[PDB]
Design an enzyme around this catalytic site. Structure first.
Site, PDB file in Angstrom:
ATOM      1  CG  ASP A  15      64.728  61.191  28.171  1.00  0.00           C
ATOM      2  OD1 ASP A  15      63.815  61.831  27.589  1.00  0.00           O
ATOM      3  OD2 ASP A  15      65.856  61.660  28.348  1.00  0.00           O
ATOM      4  NE  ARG A  29      63.866  63.795  30.640  1.00  0.00           N
ATOM      5  CZ  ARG A  29      65.007  63.221  31.058  1.00  0.00           C
ATOM      6  NH1 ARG A  29      64.925  62.077  31.688  1.00  0.00           N
ATOM      7  NH2 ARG A  29      66.237  63.749  30.816  1.00  0.00           N
ATOM      8  CG  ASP A  34      70.051  63.777  29.141  1.00  0.00           C
ATOM      9  OD1 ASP A  34      68.953  63.983  28.633  1.00  0.00           O
ATOM     10  OD2 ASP A  34      71.073  64.380  28.834  1.00  0.00           O
ATOM     11  CB  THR A  35      67.756  59.209  25.880  1.00  0.00           C
ATOM     12  OG1 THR A  35      66.547  60.003  25.854  1.00  0.00           O
ATOM     13  CG2 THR A  35      67.483  57.896  26.713  1.00  0.00           C
ATOM     14  CD  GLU A  37      66.170  66.350  23.101  1.00  0.00           C
ATOM     15  OE1 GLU A  37      65.169  66.438  22.335  1.00  0.00           O
ATOM     16  OE2 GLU A  37      66.094  66.105  24.339  1.00  0.00           O
ATOM     17  NE  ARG A  75      59.518  66.699  31.164  1.00  0.00           N
ATOM     18  CZ  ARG A  75      60.747  66.733  30.713  1.00  0.00           C
ATOM     19  NH1 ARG A  75      60.960  66.324  29.456  1.00  0.00           N
ATOM     20  NH2 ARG A  75      61.768  67.143  31.488  1.00  0.00           N
TER      21      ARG A  75
END
Ligand SMILES: Cc1cn([C@H]2C[C@H](OP(=O)(O)O)[C@@H](COP(=O)(O)O)O2)c(=O)[nH]c1=O
Ligand SMILES: [Ca+2]
Length: 129
Positions: A15, A29, A34-35, A37, A75
């Site tokens: 992401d 971002r 939310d992907t 980690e 970001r």
């Protein structure tokens, strides 16, 4: 909301992507998602998905929402398009991200994404399996 040009510098993980935007390099971002980690379950698959999607695109566009355009880490916060397809929505549709970090004022595409997550979850795809 408006699409603006940008070019891939490097796909970073599921992401975050490094893009050149208005001639400057900057890490984006992806909004509303939310992907995992890279170290977590489905993390490498989310990274690989965003990498192929962005690396294969002829045309990358960034679309800022109505609120904050940078986060506390500097970001960029945007919806990112690869040949007209929204990467944020695509990751969710595939069950490789969850809808997340929904803050008021930067949530134009919330409904669309939740709709995709419902379908991914119905299919028991990836994160939902
Ligand atoms: C997606 C998004 C993340 N963030 C911040 C919140 C989180 O703070 P904390 O780092 O303090 O947890 C972090 C999660 O990003 P990552 O999921 O890339 O780690 O990024 C925003 O502030 N606005 C946003 O729209
Ligand atoms: Ca993440």
């Amino acid at each position: 909301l408006h699409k603006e040009p940008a070019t891939l510098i490097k796909a970073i993980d599921g992401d975050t992507v490094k893009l050149m935007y208005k001639g400057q390099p900057m890490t984006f971002r992806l909004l509303l998602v939310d992907t995992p980690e890279f170290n977590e379950k489905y993390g490498p698959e989310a990274s690989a998905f965003t990498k192929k999607m962005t690396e294969n695109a002829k045309k990358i566009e960034v679309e800022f929402d109505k609120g904050q355009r940078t986060d506390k880490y500097g970001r960029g916060l945007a919806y990112i398009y690869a040949d007209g397809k929204m990467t944020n929505e695509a990751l969710v549709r595939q069950g490789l991200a969850k809808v997340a970090y929904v803050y008021k004022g930067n949530n134009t595409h919330e409904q669309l994404l939740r709709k995709a997550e419902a379908q991914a979850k119905k299919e028991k795809l990836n994160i939902w399996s």
